[PDB]
Ligand binder design. Structure first.
Ligand SMILES: CO[C@H]1O[C@H](CO)[C@@H](O)[C@H](O)[C@H]1O
Ligand SMILES: CO[C@H]1O[C@H](CO)[C@@H](O)[C@H](O)[C@H]1O
Ligand SMILES: CO[C@H]1O[C@H](CO)[C@@H](O)[C@H](O)[C@H]1O
Ligand SMILES: CO[C@H]1O[C@H](CO)[C@@H](O)[C@H](O)[C@H]1O
Lengths: 153, 152, 152, 152
């Protein structure tokens, strides 16, 4: 059959630091839900352990959180519209530089930041007219690094 | 400190350009793969979509966004590390898509599943490595597929 | 001031595995491509290597690391933006490699150059975009090739 | 043998987004790197562009597309397998870019070359591998850098 070259989306990032495992999630349908899991409490200090990305039913993935630290606080984000940017803070946690906070911005609403808004700032932006259709990164016990896939609207 | 994070090497993709690019590289091993078809096992099976998953949770389905009703499904319980995939590419309703697929682990072979006809593809990786994810293009069907690999 | 760095979308590769992965995406436009072959134009041409270059200095050569002497070269001076690449894939001395290649801009066509016979390949990008670089696999010959692209 | 082609694993990028995405992964070893600066060796050197090469043919220059006059260059003749890169990121004329860089091979070290200040970066690869190419973002300066690596 004709070998019609298949395409791979452009990427922005990753930011943060190297983690034991590389991960990627780029669903065919829009990303519509994000669940961030923390240890600690919102009245004290939040420690981001894992992130869960989902697209409609069935499509879902959880990165970070393979360690023993119990989860004690979850934040559910229901995305309305197209994500165009994500930002947050990077800092050391129990020995590793990881994503400590995170904020999702769509062309309609703003969600976050969530977590410990302290440390080194990061900002994943894409050219005007594009949208984020996925995420990839490095992770282990925690979320070491994050990057995004993007394509024209 | 900005300590460069890594991205696994890739093999492929093979097949044809499709409407959407897709990627699924879970942090835990792949353990289950569900293939959905139209047609029938007694005659000819038409591969429509593929579902990849890793326990617990972690799942994705590619292809199958169209109106064609599904009529059959085959669940592959992955035993071991996937070291290669192969199959056939043939035309279907106007497009060239993945028509058959076989998963090979050091422990056993699964497939080929689907329709054994068309152009053969073969995704092999260097010895000592294992496939830890898949990526590709898809729309109504599975247009293209490729794999992520790393040291075992 | 401190945003994450970007990587261009990719289309491909087409062809088959080769010993070395190669990549060339210069900061300035691809304006000269030199194709090196064995054999002769009055007979059949065997593509051995390809040289990509961007104005002075920026240059790379893939394939052709074998001992087979080159007896024919085709120089292509690209006028505008390359939006498509096509050609043929076929066996050469026990290897499936790029045998033929044609470059297409918005107003001109260059080639095909080489041996027009085998399995056809085509690298197309979404309208409004342009090819800004290439990647693939190579060794003695040119095993596979893919393109980097971005908006005009 | 019709096997899918492979793409080397990646580490990075580090630094900040830049106008152009760039990539250079030659088939043969990288045996020479030239760093071009403005300023002076006695005071502060400002990294403006980096030139990578393998043999007198494969060469690429990233950064330096601006009118800023160069005033110093440093040539690094790599002896062994480059297994690590490091340096500093800092502001220069309103841009966060690579200001310092150091190359480490399986034999010796080269650098740090450039200005001391800013955020450190480190591109390290798993044991047993080596850097076979580099990619990143650039404009008037070198905005971001990453490495392609494979088993040595
Ligand atoms: C506790 O160590 C584990 O978790 C951290 C954090 O996510 C990873 O960086 C590391 O590679 C993994 O082995
Ligand atoms: C029927 O057309 C749809 O499905 C095919 C196949 O999977 C895709 O290639 C195409 O882009 C999409 O629009
Ligand atoms: C002759 O063998 C060499 O050249 C061929 C073709 O380029 C490559 O596929 C192969 O890996 C390399 O070792
Ligand atoms: C002067 O501006 C130019 O050079 C800087 C630094 O290289 C790039 O970041 C920017 O995108 C490009 O347009």
């Amino acid at each position: 059959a004709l070998q019609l070259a298949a395409h791979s989306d452009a990427r922005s990032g990753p930011v943060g630091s190297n983690g034991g495992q590389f991960w990627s999630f780029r669903p065919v349908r829009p990303l519509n839900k994000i669940v961030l899991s923390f240890s600690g409490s919102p009245d004290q200090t939040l420690n981001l352990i894992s992130i869960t990305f989902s697209s409609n039913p069935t499509d879902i993935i959880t990165v970070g959180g393979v360690g023993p630290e119990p989860l004690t606080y979850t934040e559910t984000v229901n995305i309305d519209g197209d994500i165009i940017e994500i930002s947050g803070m990077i800092a050391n946690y129990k020995g590793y530089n990881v994503i400590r906070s995170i904020k999702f911005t769509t062309n309609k609403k703003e969600y976050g930041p969530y977590g410990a808004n302290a440390g080194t700032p990061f900002n994943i932006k894409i050219p005007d007219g594009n949208k984020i259709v996925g995420f990839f990164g490095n992770s282990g016990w925690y979320v070491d690094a994050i990057g995004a896939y993007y394509t024209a609207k």
